[PDB]
Symmetry: C3
Subunit: 490 residues, 3 copies
Amino acid sequence: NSTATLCLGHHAVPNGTIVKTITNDQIEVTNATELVQSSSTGGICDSPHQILDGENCTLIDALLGDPQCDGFQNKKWDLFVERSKAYSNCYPYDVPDYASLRSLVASSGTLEFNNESFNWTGVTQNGTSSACKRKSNNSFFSRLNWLTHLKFKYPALNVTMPNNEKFDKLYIWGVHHPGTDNDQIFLYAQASGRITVSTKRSQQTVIPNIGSRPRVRNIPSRISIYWTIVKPGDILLINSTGNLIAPRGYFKIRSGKSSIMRSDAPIGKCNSECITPNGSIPNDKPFQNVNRITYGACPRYVKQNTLKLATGMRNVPEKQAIAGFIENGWEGMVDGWYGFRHQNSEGIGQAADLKSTQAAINQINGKLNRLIGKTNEKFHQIEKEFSEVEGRIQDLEKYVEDTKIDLWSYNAELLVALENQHTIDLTDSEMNKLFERTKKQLRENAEDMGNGCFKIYHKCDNACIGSIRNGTYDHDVYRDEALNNRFQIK
Amino acid sequence: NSTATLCLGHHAVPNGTIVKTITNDQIEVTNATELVQSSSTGGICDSPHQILDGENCTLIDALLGDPQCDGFQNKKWDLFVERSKAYSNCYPYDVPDYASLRSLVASSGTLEFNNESFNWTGVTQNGTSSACKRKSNNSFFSRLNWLTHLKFKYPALNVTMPNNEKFDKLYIWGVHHPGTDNDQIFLYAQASGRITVSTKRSQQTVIPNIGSRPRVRNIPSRISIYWTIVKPGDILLINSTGNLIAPRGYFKIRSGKSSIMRSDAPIGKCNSECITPNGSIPNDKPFQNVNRITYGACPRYVKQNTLKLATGMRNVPEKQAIAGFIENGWEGMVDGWYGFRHQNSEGIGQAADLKSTQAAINQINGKLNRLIGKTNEKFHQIEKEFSEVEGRIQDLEKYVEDTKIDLWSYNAELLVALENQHTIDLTDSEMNKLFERTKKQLRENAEDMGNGCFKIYHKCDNACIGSIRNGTYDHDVYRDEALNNRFQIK
Amino acid sequence: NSTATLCLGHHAVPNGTIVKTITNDQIEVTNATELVQSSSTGGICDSPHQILDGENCTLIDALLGDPQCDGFQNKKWDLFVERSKAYSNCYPYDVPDYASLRSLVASSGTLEFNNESFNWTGVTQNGTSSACKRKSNNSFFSRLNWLTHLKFKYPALNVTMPNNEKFDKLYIWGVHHPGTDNDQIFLYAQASGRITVSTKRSQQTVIPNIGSRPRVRNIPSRISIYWTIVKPGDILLINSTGNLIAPRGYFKIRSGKSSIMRSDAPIGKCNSECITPNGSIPNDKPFQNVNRITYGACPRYVKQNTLKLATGMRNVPEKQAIAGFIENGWEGMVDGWYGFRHQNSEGIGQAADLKSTQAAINQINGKLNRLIGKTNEKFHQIEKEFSEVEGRIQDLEKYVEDTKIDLWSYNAELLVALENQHTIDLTDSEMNKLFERTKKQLRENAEDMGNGCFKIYHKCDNACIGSIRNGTYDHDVYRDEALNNRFQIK
Ligand SMILES: *[C@@H]1O[C@H](CO)[C@@H](O[C@@H]2O[C@H](CO)[C@@H](O[C@H]3O[C@H](CO)[C@@H](O)[C@H](O)[C@@H]3O)[C@H](O)[C@H]2NC(C)=O)[C@H](O)[C@H]1NC(C)=O
Ligand SMILES: *[C@@H]1O[C@H](CO)[C@@H](O[C@@H]2O[C@H](CO)[C@@H](O[C@H]3O[C@H](CO)[C@@H](O)[C@H](O)[C@@H]3O)[C@H](O)[C@H]2NC(C)=O)[C@H](O)[C@H]1NC(C)=O
Ligand SMILES: *[C@@H]1O[C@H](CO)[C@@H](O[C@@H]2O[C@H](CO)[C@@H](O[C@H]3O[C@H](CO)[C@@H](O)[C@H](O)[C@@H]3O)[C@H](O)[C@H]2NC(C)=O)[C@H](O)[C@H]1NC(C)=O
Ligand SMILES: *[C@@H]1O[C@H](CO)[C@@H](O[C@@H]2O[C@H](CO)[C@@H](O)[C@H](O)[C@H]2NC(C)=O)[C@H](O)[C@H]1NC(C)=O
Ligand SMILES: *[C@@H]1O[C@H](CO)[C@@H](O[C@@H]2O[C@H](CO)[C@@H](O)[C@H](O)[C@H]2NC(C)=O)[C@H](O)[C@H]1NC(C)=O
Ligand SMILES: *[C@@H]1O[C@H](CO)[C@@H](O[C@@H]2O[C@H](CO)[C@@H](O)[C@H](O)[C@H]2NC(C)=O)[C@H](O)[C@H]1NC(C)=O
Ligand SMILES: *[C@@H]1O[C@H](CO)[C@@H](O)[C@H](O)[C@H]1NC(C)=O
Ligand SMILES: *[C@@H]1O[C@H](CO)[C@@H](O)[C@H](O)[C@H]1NC(C)=O
Ligand SMILES: *[C@@H]1O[C@H](CO)[C@@H](O)[C@H](O)[C@H]1NC(C)=O
Ligand SMILES: *[C@@H]1O[C@H](CO)[C@@H](O)[C@H](O)[C@H]1NC(C)=O
Ligand SMILES: *[C@@H]1O[C@H](CO)[C@@H](O)[C@H](O)[C@H]1NC(C)=O
Ligand SMILES: *[C@@H]1O[C@H](CO)[C@@H](O)[C@H](O)[C@H]1NC(C)=O
Ligand SMILES: *[C@@H]1O[C@H](CO)[C@@H](O)[C@H](O)[C@H]1NC(C)=O
Ligand SMILES: *[C@@H]1O[C@H](CO)[C@@H](O)[C@H](O)[C@H]1NC(C)=O
Ligand SMILES: *[C@@H]1O[C@H](CO)[C@@H](O)[C@H](O)[C@H]1NC(C)=O
Ligand SMILES: *[C@@H]1O[C@H](CO)[C@@H](O)[C@H](O)[C@H]1NC(C)=O
Ligand SMILES: *[C@@H]1O[C@H](CO)[C@@H](O)[C@H](O)[C@H]1NC(C)=O
Ligand SMILES: *[C@@H]1O[C@H](CO)[C@@H](O)[C@H](O)[C@H]1NC(C)=O
Ligand SMILES: *[C@@H]1O[C@H](CO)[C@@H](O)[C@H](O)[C@H]1NC(C)=O
Ligand SMILES: *[C@@H]1O[C@H](CO)[C@@H](O)[C@H](O)[C@H]1NC(C)=O
Ligand SMILES: *[C@@H]1O[C@H](CO)[C@@H](O)[C@H](O)[C@H]1NC(C)=O
Ligand SMILES: *[C@@H]1O[C@H](CO)[C@@H](O)[C@H](O)[C@H]1NC(C)=O
Ligand SMILES: *[C@@H]1O[C@H](CO)[C@@H](O)[C@H](O)[C@H]1NC(C)=O
Ligand SMILES: *[C@@H]1O[C@H](CO)[C@@H](O)[C@H](O)[C@H]1NC(C)=O
């Protein structure tokens, strides 16, 4: 007796987790948290973004006014969702640069349409087809006007529509390509000639081309769709002698945050900021491996399926007399991260050190706050999956996205390694600081035993040990006793 | 008496600045410097890049030779500046793929034009229009030759121009689209037919299309502009029966560092390496938030409006007997960053430690030198602002630039946090090293009081203290005295 | 006598290497390794990727079936290598969107072709030209069928080919543009009319255009090449009255990892994973400055020509009595990185410390293992060099690649600086840890002399010194002797 022991230590847990640092590929820590979101519910939540489920209609079918899409008239969206089951059920058509028209309508986010009174003096309006039935009757695209001859005449059309509004107008129109010369004459009363649609700033001339194409819904003819945007103070001029599928008015074109996504995920009554084709995903984590296609406030796509961020210190087994932190953790330390164990006249005890514990916890929570719940919003982007082979432009779209993903995946990998190294360093540092402060209090009254413990060379009862732990130990009170015990001749 | 005190310390300032590190969102340091350039003068400096102010002319108007652009003939530039007020004042035209022709001329950086003698036997040359007045007379684009019938004949043209030069030739030509069939006959004496312009490696066939477009400067006709590059040893062949707006020669096409920028900033007589649409900006800082559009040696565009780099240590208030660096800075320390305070027989004093101060300053200046004045040059890039809706290609251009900016903004954020953490570490380290070296000199003659000070257990006058500070203190001289004082029984 | 000295130290080498850290632009370390691959052998190794050397043929010439390319029929590749000497030797042709057709065939990786029996009732098949000789006879592209009139009739063709297969079909076809009206009549017996090639999902109409182009291999006519992909359950329909260069069947179109590269490097019998235009390169290093164009498992392209990664500690000259690590390295320490030197009754000695040496070496090898031999594979990408001026799309392709390279170059620069700082820190740390452990063993029996050495205040013979070095020194055995020597009055 006449001496006491005081050990400094830190906790350890039975169920640690492996993380990666700069120093170590694999190091066990007491706790970690996942930074890559890897699952979705599988449903797209209908809140807080305005979702429009296309059901059997593509956006372009909804635009033109396919009868099955009549329910979509004038609707708006943040996200238009196109289904793989979607199919057209009207006159067969193509759109040169379909992808662009789809994109610009998607981004505009509205199907608002304003009817206008075009002067079609001299032709028959409202042509119909058995290939486009509406309520069991022969019909046509709602937003288009199939003009045909009147009394076997089709006068040369030269029709104007000024934009006297403060906003832009989007006009959608078409050219009919009849399957045969018989159809050409039956419909327009004369041989086919070019169609020219112009403004002060633009001109588009299109040549109708007679001929059979493979029948689609029993139709060998085609309609080719074109568009023209007309600015305030400009004028639409339409010049034709036949084959014109005419506009009935204009679409409003807006700018904002709207987009389109291909998905078969069901739409749920729930609330989630981040939408992917697989369904909505939580956006607490900074990264995700669910889908490169996203809409809203979303984690960034990375290639990794897991990245673990340390949220506690190195986890060190307890060695099997009391002993301190040197190659030794304390599994019995459960009310703190760092603490003291002592042996004195009155027994062997343990107490947590609150200051050091809280300093480590605060710093860890600091970095969690920078990384958790901090995702940023993206809206209309580029397409990232393709159903047809196209070459150059598609090669570029793919390479852009590959490039981006690899750079983010590298950033994620480095960030987590750096953060984890910093966490191991800051938690190791709190242990070292606690030891050093204790060493300083004890002055000449103790010696360092090399194992994270001090040999205190005087009687140091429970109150004395408490004084060291609360930082009120007065070394002068004990120095005489201690020096005599230390520097005695044995 | 019979003892002295020696404290180690570091400076502190009354007006510190907040920075971000890896450890802390907000930590006050003694000084910092801004790494994001956020202002411009508002003028584009005319030095050291060769600036060409388009004034009322676009590059394309200057190319074709609109009369108001006659002053631009044969000029070169590093940067062509196009003004929002620019307007065309000649025959109305369009350019299929205007953006590409604009880009390739801009990048070439020259309007040098070499006249050639084309053999236009059988037609009238030099047609003019009241829509394109030059010096009050009817005229036309300077670089183009409006051919019309001769004696009411327009023979089929089949005209050749070999490239026997060592460099490439850029040919600009056009097709006239008359407003009516009357104009077609009045000008070319016959019905319109295709124009074919070919080389050994290329062919472009264009169909003139008669019809009224909305009048522009009272003209319902149009000219569509095309271009053809002809290689050394190749040959231009022009084949037409009318409607040909012919070239008068070729433009030199160069390769180099030239570009074009849309800006309304006035041009100043001043010198600045980095140009943005907002005006020139200083390029000392590594980052900038003025404009994503830049030309020359420019900071990189980031989203942040400020990033502060620490250029001094943690700023710690002085606690209100002398005391050392432990939770305590020295506001009275003004001739150094680190130093010594002492109490002895002769009073209380302070002296700066030059070595430690200079070590910290040098390292900080080291990192300033890597980051300040080190910008790199970019020249012709992609467009980043768009006046029309286009869909797919524009979506890709935008996404490429968004992607780039977010990656750089992340790099900037991480770099500054890392550098700041390193600065806090290196400045803390110089303090700790100074304490340790002093501790080592004193040997058994002093004890650490826990507050950044030593209790020296012998009389230590001003010269003795100086000896410790200059590193020449001989502990053996004082050991006997010191040991007696330390290990006395009180 | 009655004392001993024990110094802790670390090795130093006569031939150190300069590296960059976060702290220092230039710091000498004992060893480093290069992370940028800067040379190639200059040959493309024929293993392990399937190489197809185009020799005198482009891919497109091999596709169409130019006679000099007959050897390529039905071949597959991972990498098709196109030579700058390649030239066409058949009928002159162009391909609108040549780059896309080249890319999609390259990416598909196969020239497998399946003949089909088209019903060409009413025309002459197998037209030939003296411009396309095969085995000295007039011939034509192997995969194309030049149809001409039969008995001075050319009936309107309306020919079908269903896809009843489970895979897609790629059809290549053409339109002949005769030099004169005489040739048109001689070949097709009538005036030229449009050609329409259609499916259920697509239509392409092309207008043959009569006229002389500059003679190529004495031919003023041209063939323009087009392609059509036909899906399972779809049907190809060809509709023409002349000028049709017909398909003889279809190409298989596959998806996989194939690509094309322009290179003049000879092909060698050797094995290398990474191919560049300059030749194959080793892929041990994480970065390379040989070529931005790569195929296979390749280091990432960066702008730097060298980045040195530290693989040893700071290299410190030996100062010219034994001395420890403080501003002092040990050039005579050759069997370890860290160790002990001593002076005692029995002489002066040196021994390496294995634990500390191995801890540093292991960590360094750890980071080498993460960076060396870990390259990732890329296959078909975008083009990165261009022989013609094109404007907008090329500007984007270039900017995408510039952007990527600058971001990777920054990542490389930062990574190496960070790693090197960490290596200096971990090697410095092993030295400091060894000193501290020794200090702890010695307890009150030694004093720190400030130069990396302890003065041990008792007789400490070779076995005693060994006990300290193996960590079995019992301080209690010597304490009485040591305390008497330390705290004597001199
Ligand atoms: C050019 O060739 C085409 C393909 O051979 C051909 O299309 C085919 O036309 C037939 C005849 O009408 C269609 O067959 C239909 O026959 C009866 C007619 O009463 C219908 O009741 C059936 O529904 C049956 O389908 C084919 O469907 C059609 N084939 C394709 C692939 O579309 C064109 O008619 C030809 N064009 C010309 C101008 O001759
Ligand atoms: C097809 O329709 C066009 C638009 O309605 C029409 O253009 C318009 O033509 C008129 C008549 O020339 C122009 O009006 C001008 O009238 C007198 C004529 O002496 C002039 O002095 C005035 O300057 C006045 O502007 C319109 O300017 C013009 N409108 C537009 C929008 O360009 C075409 O003429 C029609 N084309 C055909 C072939 O009939
Ligand atoms: C339109 O102009 C073209 C260029 O002037 C012209 O092409 C040239 O045609 C001549 C005549 O055939 C070729 O010259 C050849 O002359 C003899 C004919 O026996 C040959 O043996 C020689 O090989 C010699 O080359 C030129 O080669 C050719 N020039 C070019 C650049 O192709 C067209 O013929 C003209 N077209 C029309 C319809 O008149
Ligand atoms: C554009 O409209 C004008 C009429 O304003 C058309 O010109 C007329 O065409 C008819 C029949 O082709 C001719 O008989 C008339 O002589 C023309 N009138 C005038 C005033 O020139 C013109 O054809 C239309 N263009 C197109 C491509 O359909
Ligand atoms: C290209 O030039 C040739 C003349 O070298 C044109 O061919 C002549 O065209 C006229 C009028 O159309 C005919 O009467 C002659 O018989 C043609 N001459 C020959 C030698 O064929 C040809 O039309 C021009 N092509 C174009 C598109 O304008
Ligand atoms: C596509 O094929 C059809 C035949 O199936 C062509 O139509 C015939 O064309 C000839 C000559 O031009 C006419 O005499 C016949 O009256 C047409 N037959 C029918 C049934 O209409 C048609 O011309 C072809 N199209 C093209 C562009 O070549
Ligand atoms: C582990 O870390 C996370 C994030 O700080 C925390 O929410 C969780 O409660 C911790 N788990 C344990 C067992 O401490
Ligand atoms: C979509 O089409 C399918 C199959 O034709 C049909 O059964 C279903 O009811 C349609 N859904 C809607 C909303 O019209
Ligand atoms: C409609 O067009 C014709 C031109 O053919 C014109 O004469 C008529 O007045 C127009 N009707 C209007 C403007 O109501
Ligand atoms: C065309 O149809 C619409 C109803 O869809 C009708 O309001 C309009 O009067 C019709 N016009 C003519 C000329 O039949
Ligand atoms: C998301 O869907 C894609 C296909 O679009 C699939 O590759 C991926 O595995 C999905 N991820 C899930 C369901 O977690
Ligand atoms: C603080 O110190 C007192 C005596 O100074 C000691 O008895 C006690 O254990 C310490 N802690 C608390 C919470 O009172
Ligand atoms: C703060 O730091 C900058 C950059 O080193 C320096 O130029 C400036 O003089 C410093 N300011 C003060 C008050 O020390
Ligand atoms: C540009 O045009 C404006 C308005 O027409 C004119 O006042 C001004 O003088 C022009 N500037 C030049 C340099 O021609
Ligand atoms: C110009 O062109 C005609 C072809 O119509 C030719 O006959 C004449 O010789 C040419 N003049 C020259 C080459 O000076
Ligand atoms: C055409 O105009 C230019 C002056 O701009 C003149 O040099 C040339 O001789 C003219 N040619 C003819 C045929 O009038
Ligand atoms: C630079 O100009 C852009 C518009 O081009 C503007 O958004 C930005 O605020 C400007 N920055 C300045 C003047 O600092
Ligand atoms: C250096 O040491 C001397 C005595 O050794 C002392 O008097 C003095 O204060 C110190 N500094 C200078 C600059 O002389
Ligand atoms: C230097 O480092 C490399 C990589 O660890 C190693 O292979 C090489 O043997 C080392 N060279 C020396 C002289 O130690
Ligand atoms: C390629 O062409 C050259 C020059 O015409 C010829 O000498 C060589 O033999 C050709 N090579 C092959 C493989 O045909
Ligand atoms: C080939 O084409 C003709 C159409 O002109 C057809 O009548 C004939 O039967 C066809 N031959 C076949 C299918 O063998
Ligand atoms: C066309 O040529 C091929 C050989 O290349 C032959 O098999 C086929 O019978 C020929 N057909 C005709 C109609 O001459
Ligand atoms: C690789 O080839 C390119 C040209 O394609 C050249 O710029 C570069 O110097 C080459 N690098 C070598 C041979 O190391
Ligand atoms: C280990 O210690 C023994 C005595 O304890 C000493 O003699 C020896 O030098 C040390 N090393 C080895 C390898 O025996």
